[PDB]
Amino acid sequence: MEFDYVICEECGKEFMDSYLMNHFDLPTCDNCRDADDKHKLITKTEAKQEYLLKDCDLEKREPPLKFIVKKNPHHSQWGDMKLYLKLQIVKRSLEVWGSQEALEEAKEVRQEN
């Protein structure tokens, strides 16, 4: 219901909530999160064609990496799209297909069939 002791696991600052603790329930402030890439959320479809992930570390991780919603500025359903903690689907992706270089061979396994 309320939060008055959410300590960041990066700076260690006590606060009520932030960008990640607002809807991601992440114990980190907006001063430590690096949306540029670290916390840079990712597009669900992006985790499917970028990490070739399936119903495991996307919507079956239980919890399925907290997701969100926005309006992709590209040509897609920006009326109600959904995103996902990028850094989460990133680590899970490496353990999913193997790693980064491996993730590459994966994109080919999908562009080969």
Ligand SMILES: [Zn+2]
């Ligand atoms: Zn912090």
